[PDB]
Structure formats: structure tokens, C-alpha cells
Scaffold this active site. Sequence first.
Site, mmCIF file in Angstrom:
data_model
loop_
_atom_site.group_PDB
_atom_site.id
_atom_site.type_symbol
_atom_site.label_atom_id
_atom_site.label_comp_id
_atom_site.label_asym_id
_atom_site.label_seq_id
_atom_site.Cartn_x
_atom_site.Cartn_y
_atom_site.Cartn_z
ATOM 1 N N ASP B 53 0.852 -1.179 0.000
ATOM 2 C CA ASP B 53 0.000 0.000 0.000
ATOM 3 C C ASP B 53 0.893 1.237 0.000
ATOM 4 O O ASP B 53 2.063 1.166 0.372
ATOM 5 C CB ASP B 53 -0.904 0.008 1.245
ATOM 6 C CG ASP B 53 -2.365 0.301 0.915
ATOM 7 O OD1 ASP B 53 -3.175 0.474 1.859
ATOM 8 O OD2 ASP B 53 -2.706 0.351 -0.287
ATOM 9 N N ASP B 55 0.269 5.277 1.148
ATOM 10 C CA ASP B 55 -0.638 6.291 1.644
ATOM 11 C C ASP B 55 0.204 7.529 1.788
ATOM 12 O O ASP B 55 1.413 7.437 1.968
ATOM 13 C CB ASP B 55 -1.225 5.909 3.006
ATOM 14 C CG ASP B 55 -1.626 4.441 3.092
ATOM 15 O OD1 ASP B 55 -0.723 3.585 3.237
ATOM 16 O OD2 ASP B 55 -2.841 4.135 3.014
ATOM 17 N N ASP B 112 0.059 4.624 16.068
ATOM 18 C CA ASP B 112 0.307 3.420 16.852
ATOM 19 C C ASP B 112 1.736 2.962 17.097
ATOM 20 O O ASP B 112 2.294 3.226 18.153
ATOM 21 C CB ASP B 112 -0.449 2.248 16.249
ATOM 22 C CG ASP B 112 -1.942 2.388 16.396
ATOM 23 O OD1 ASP B 112 -2.390 3.433 16.939
ATOM 24 O OD2 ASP B 112 -2.664 1.453 15.970
HETATM 25 MG MG LIG Z 1 -5.385 -0.858 3.223
#
Ligand SMILES: [Mg+2]
Lengths: 388, 388
Positions: B53, B55, B112
Site C-alpha cells: 500500500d 498512503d 500506533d
Molecule cells: Mg489498506
Amino acid sequence: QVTVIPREQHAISRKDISENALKVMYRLNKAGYEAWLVGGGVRDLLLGKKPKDFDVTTNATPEQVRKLFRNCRLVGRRFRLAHVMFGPEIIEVATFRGNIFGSIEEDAQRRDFTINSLYYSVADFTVRDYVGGMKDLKDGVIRLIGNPETRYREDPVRMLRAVRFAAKLGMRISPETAEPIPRLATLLNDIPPARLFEESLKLLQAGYGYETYKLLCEYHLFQPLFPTITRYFTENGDSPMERIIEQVLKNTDTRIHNDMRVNPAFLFAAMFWYPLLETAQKIAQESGLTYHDAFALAMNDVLDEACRSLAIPKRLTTLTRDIWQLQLRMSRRQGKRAWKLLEHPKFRAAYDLLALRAEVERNAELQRLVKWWGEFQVSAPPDQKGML
Amino acid sequence: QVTVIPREQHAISRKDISENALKVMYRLNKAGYEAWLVGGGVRDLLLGKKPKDFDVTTNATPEQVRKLFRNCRLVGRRFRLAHVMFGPEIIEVATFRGNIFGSIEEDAQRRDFTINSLYYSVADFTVRDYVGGMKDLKDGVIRLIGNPETRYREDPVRMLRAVRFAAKLGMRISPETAEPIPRLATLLNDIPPARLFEESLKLLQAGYGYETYKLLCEYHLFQPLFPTITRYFTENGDSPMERIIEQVLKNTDTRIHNDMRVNPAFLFAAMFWYPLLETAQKIAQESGLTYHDAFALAMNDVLDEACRSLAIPKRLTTLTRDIWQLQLRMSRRQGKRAWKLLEHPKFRAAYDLLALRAEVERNAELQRLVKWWGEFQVSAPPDQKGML
Ligand SMILES: [Mg+2]
Ligand SMILES: [Mg+2]
């Protein structure tokens, strides 16, 4: 002479075995008109079988009929024939025919065959036989109504039906009704490919394709429809292609009899396999191209050939091609790229085409690819791991 | 500390591996906005691997990112976080967090874990390590951000994530980041049911489920999720239910990794099998009635208390019902219904549940049913018939 036959003597087509499509005749009778049961069911019912459709016929304008059922879920469209729905039940309600329509006797003549033209009324439990009907049904005779020669010419398709029913039911074709066919066979090529398709599936899919193939060949009625195949029969009679079609039909027959949904695209990709495999090898040597691309070419060739006679839906064609493609990959002793196939929505077909290919060519090398994908498709991921 | 790292001192992370969210970052940079690539892949790029991924985060307000993109395809909605769609590669652009919206150091905080907080800018080819990240990511340690104890109480799910990443990549959980879990675990039943479901599948159905299960058992995080199951664990260590679960995982793992696809309805129907089988024994041998009907209650109960913790969608449960149903149907040696069964959509699963039920129990009266259904589904109609 023997026009009206009463309940006790007609193989009790016992009122209670009529799908409640009686509720639709009732609204007709309870409305001044008269309604009857024809062909399809009345045939089967009288024989003994469990009818496979109930078709009513009335003398109500296809207009009046539309009015009397405003409350009902009637799926319109289409002239003469009016449709009605329930659940998994649809009821055909067609007005008589003959300025246009008229008596129940006028209608009895425009129909194709004898047996398929017997009328039943729930009001009096009698069945009207305005044709050889009964006698013919008894003897197991498929007889065309008017002058065979003339009717066939009017609608060549009737030739196909004449042979289909003949193979579906276990009876013989009427003499004066069989002669014309071999000759007039050619007459089908004048029919929209769109239709020769519809009518071809009703022959081979429908559950009686082996016998129906035995007939469509013995009346050269196969020629007009499947040129691309005719072409390859060997007077011998044991060509691997010939065997393939016979088997794929016996099998597709079993399926339909044991209720198993069947593939229409599978059927063709099975029949046209060898002819495809032939045009493959042919363009190979005659144009020294690479096999994978030669074969890829041949596909287009065989299809627009058949497509010329039978208008096959662009839908079914795509699949077919895939069912074939996989016939390549599935051989290439593959590795970790096989899971990808095991997943193809068509793997099932492709497989079953390989099941046959190995079956008819009684080739041990092929039959290995099957004993293998046999394990590898039902195995579990751990073993499926090792196998690769 | 070491706040910023140059592209010559930081692992490859060569701009050419960043597919093309690059076109989304460039549009921001050209507009006087900050474009940082954060999260998953940004972590992996460092390790060397390939980002699953991409982002991106920016100091552009969400209603600003809207203007500078009113052109492109924004699968909008979701406060903050705007969705840019190329198509099979969608890019996420989220605004920095904090009084509401803030800067990069501010955002890196509310994140996190460590390694999941390294930032990258195409602008200067530098990674920003405000947290431990780098070191952590080298040593291979899953360290939480602020104070373990308080964040876990903030959002318990954070603990689940802790093990999840711990399992996925081959790293260990930081001491301070672990101590609290065994104690705070029970805090999960205070979490919406539907939400756990997501996070439950994100754990097992993610192709790491075997290593992740072991870590869920060693931190008593499994119990709060699958109470219905914990209850039947045996001190001896490896019962039949205790093997069935390790296998269904190891396998559902294998699949996911060999890019197959996977049935969740299956995963569960497997785990909860023996437990169901246990509620069958009792519901039967007591309040004594037929095993079939008994088994029918055994289902509603298990799903009921299980769906009290996990929120399995009516959809999934219904397929689970089937897979179980078929375990009896298939049990009883018989035929003719066979095809009617082989045609069942959730048959593929059912078979594979028997696949396991046989493996784990080593019972040759099942491995027998398997060697059957195995052969009855690969062989064509002529044999499929004789097998009845
Ligand atoms: Mg995702
Ligand atoms: Mg019908």
C-alpha cells in the site's frame, strides 16, 4: 370419425394431475369463453409421463383475455399468445387461429403434429381428436398435419421438430411425413442463424441429444446446421472426432436426466474441438508459424464458419475459446502458476474436455494429465504444495 | 536522536519503486503543500520488500485537497483522508493531525507503532524519524508510541494490531509494549462486535494466521474473541480441535500466499466445528431427541454466543450453516441425491472441511469418504453413474 373421447376410456389424464393452471381456465369458463389443454402436456399425460408444461388455448380475443386478467401477473408482449405467472409456474394462454381465428377445429389444423394437437377441457373431462392424434399416439407415430411437402417449405424448422419429437418420445416418423426431409434438408440454410441456434439447443441440450443426433445424421439434417463438422466425418465411422460427439452427447444426456445444470458453451467446444485442432495443424505446416499463434488463429476461423450457420451468442463464444485455451496450458507440465488455473471459472469445463479427449483418443499420455489434475484439484494445499 | 536521514544513508528507497502516487504527491508539492509517504510500504521499502500500500499525508486541509483535486476521481466521504482513484491502485491522502489539524511531528505521535511511522518525501528524498522507527525497524522490534497502558485503554484494538504486525514481519514485541496485554486483554469485550470481526479477519484471513494465532494464544488475546472455542482447549496440548485450527490456518495461509482466494465462511465453519459437535453430543444425550434435529439447535447456539463476541454477517453465517449441513449429507453413503449435492455452491468448502476432519482425526472411515467424494467429482458421467 372418432372426434370426442371421454374420461374413462382415455388413459385417465386424471384432472388432479393438472398443475393448478386450472385456476386460469376456471376464470375463462367462469367468464363465458371456453378453454382447453393442448400438445405438450395432454400428450405426456395421456401417455403416462409427468407433463412438462400446461398450455391452455381459448377463443377469447387476445384482447378480452388481457382484460379478464388485470388482477393477474401477466407478462405481456407477443401476439396471440398471452402469458401468466405464479411461482415457478407460467401459463401459456393462446387464442385460437384460422378472419384470423375461429373454431377449435380451425386451430387444430395450423398445428404441426398429430399427437401435439389433442385438446382437453376440464369442464367435460373429454379430449377432442381432430387429427390422427389418438391412433398415432397409440402406435407411436410422428405425423405432420397438412401436406408435408408444403408445410416444410412454409417453415423448414418443422423438419427439425419432426425428428426431435421422434427421438424424444420413443416413436417412429410417419412415412409420408419422412420422405420429403432428406430432400428439403438443404432448405434450412435460408433460416436466420439466430433461430437455427435456438432450435439446435432444443435438439442436443434438452436431454435426448444422443438419439436426436442419430436421427439428425440419418436424415442429412445435421449437414445444414454443422457444416464445419460434417466435413470431417470418416466413412470409416470411428474417427476420434466422431466418438467425441457421440460421448459428449450421451454424457450431456445423463446430466440433464439427473438434473445437473449443463454448459451450452461446453457442448460446442467439445464438438468443434477436433475440427479446430485440424485447422490448427493445417495452418501450422502451411504457414510455418508458431503453434500457439497458429492455434490462436484457427479459433477465429472455425467460429465464424459455424457462426455463419448457427448464430451463436457472443456470450457463449468467449467461454468456448477459454475452454479451448486451457487445453494448452493444462498440458504444459506447469509449476506454481497452476493455482491460477485451478481457479478459472472455466476450469471445470476445460477439465471435462480433457476427460473426454483422453477418453476417445485412448491416448495414455493424455490420460495422465487427467489422473494428475484429478488429484491436484481435490487435494489439500499441503499436498497440492508438494505436487508442484 | 537522529531526526532526518538522507537518501544516501537510507536503504535503497529509490523513487522508482513508488508506483505512481508520485503523481498525487507532485500535484501537492507544485501547490505549496507537503507530501510525505507514510505507513506500510514506506516501512517495507526500507526493509527492501515491495509496498502493499502507499498512503500519503499533507498539511493541506481536507477541503483544500478537495479543490486541488476536484478534477480527479475522489471516492470522497470519510472526514480527513481523501481518496484518489487511478483504478487498480487507489491512493490515500490524509491531513496531519493534532488544535485540530497540525504538523508532521504532531501527526507522527498519534500513530500506533514505530516502524509504521516513518515518513518519506519525494521532495527531498529523506525519511523523517521522529519516533524510534529506524533503530526499531533494524533490530526488528514492534514498539508502541506513547504510554502502552493508556493507549491500550484508549483503543484496545491497538493490542491486537501489536501481535498482528509482530506476526506478519518477523519481529518481536517491545518489553514495555507487551507487559500490559495479558492484563488488559479482557478490555476487548468492551469493543463493538462488528468491529472485532474486521480485526479478526485482518488477523487470520491475512495469510499469516498461523503465526498470528500462536501469538494470540500466548498473550491471552484469543480468549476474548473466540470464547466458544477457548472453552474446549485441552491441557494435553493437541486435541482434534487443536490441530484442526492450526491446520485450517497453515492452509488458509498457503492459499493467500500462492495468491489464491479464500472463503471466510469456511475458516469459521472449521474452527467452530468440534465445538458444534460438542453441543450436539450434549443436546442429544440429554433432552434426548434425533441427532439431526439436535445438531440443528447446536448450530443456532454456537453461532449465537459466538456472534455475541464476533459480529459475523447474516450472509457469512448462512454459508457456515451449509458447510456444516453437508457434513452429514455427505456422511451417509448414498447416491442419486449425489449430483443434486455436487451442484451445491458451498460444496467445494464442505468437501475441504471433510478434508480436514479426516486429516486431524486420522479416522480411516472418513479418509474413506474423502477418497470417494474425491474420485466421484473428478471422473466424468459414465463413472459417476457406476459409483452409485
Ligand atoms: Mg489498506
Ligand atoms: Mg415453460
